[PDB]
Amino acid sequence: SAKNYINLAQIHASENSKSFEQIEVERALRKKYARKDEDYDSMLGITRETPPELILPDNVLPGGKPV
Amino acid sequence: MILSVLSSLALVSGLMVVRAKNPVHSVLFFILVFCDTSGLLLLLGLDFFAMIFLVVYIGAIAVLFLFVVMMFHIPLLPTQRNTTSLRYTVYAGKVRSWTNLETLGNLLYTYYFVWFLVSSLILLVAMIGAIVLTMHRT
Fold this sequence. Notes:
By secondary structure, chain A is an all-alpha fold. Chain A has helices spanning 2-16, 20-32, 38-43.
């Protein structure tokens, strides 16, 4: 627990310190990619991947789910 | 007698269409049904429709069906002793006699032109529907 909360605190540090201009982009990206549609995306030939800013580090996952 | 044998063969092909063993032979008999039907229309005197039946039915619809099947696997009594000589022919109207095509095109695009545009809209619906459903594009 002591070791895990150390890497848990990094996301809170990188989140509470975000600037307002970054927060606008973050909220826009979060709302834009809230839900997906395989049908229309496949029809257009494109795949909508989550942006890198919207990826939590694997060390705070329930035990590691990179996929 | 040409009508009787042609109609009988068309009827047999149509019957075998619905009781076929495999879809390929079903489509093959489906083509023969329209072949006989076009011949029958040709006997009727409408050459234009008789050949549109080749162009559309066994030209595009039959090809489409075959493509899909390939993958994804009071009367007058017959007494005519004194009627073949009682034919009165009005020669007026034989001069400048139009065909089945000129007559049809005279009034298809000019008087009844709304229905023509409705058929165009039907074709557009078909074209759009064939795309929205089947574009996987993976």
